[PDB]
Structures are given as C-alpha cells and as structure tokens.
C-alpha cells in the first residue's frame, strides 16, 4: 500500500513489538510476509506511535524483509543498534 518509513530509537528492552510471518510460517494463508502482531506498552514503537498491529514489515535498516523466513527476520531486527529505519506498509 503506502510505504511508511518509521524512525525508531531502540529501547533498553528492544524495539517493543512482536512479529509473525515468513517463509514456512505464514501469518495469513498464501502470504509469506512479516507482520506486526503486538506492540507492547511503554516500548519504543508504542511511544513513537506510528507502528500498528497488522503492519507488513518491508525492511529494517539495510536488510530486506520481503519473502524471508521467520528466522532471517528475527535476526535482522535483533541485530540492529540504537537507531532503526523501519519500512512498513499499512493494511488495505
């Protein structure tokens, strides 16, 4: 849909959301993409307040999140440091 780029400061606890999706772990039938399922209270994503449950993750910094496995996505999002560009697209 509309490409949103959200800029986040990584909190001590991490980014403050949870994801599902990936190759071999579809969150929706026929769709491999990475989705945000939860935004925890008091976290970085919550307090910035642009990210939303249901949002498809497209990229984190210099790493692409289209058609990757759940594990490639998890290491990509956890191997960040302090400052993060998050590319997402909002649901239709």
């Amino acid at each position: 849909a509309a490409i949103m780029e959200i800029k986040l400061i990584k909190g001590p606890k991490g980014l403050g959301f949870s994801i599902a999706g990936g190759v071999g772990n579809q969150h929706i039938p026929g769709d491999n993409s990475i989705y945000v399922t939860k935004i925890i209270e008091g976290g970085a994503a919550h307090k910035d307040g642009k990210l939303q449950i249901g949002d498809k993750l497209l990229a984190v910094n210099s790493v692409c999140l289209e058609e990757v496995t759940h594990e490639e996505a998890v290491t990509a999002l956890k191997n960040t440091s302090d400052f993060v560009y998050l590319k997402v697209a909002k649901p239709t």
Partner: peptide
Amino acid sequence: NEKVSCV
C-alpha cells in the same frame, strides 16, 4: 501453529 517473536 505459527511462530511469533519478540523484537
């Protein structure tokens, strides 16, 4: 069954 990960 699907995997959800904290981040």
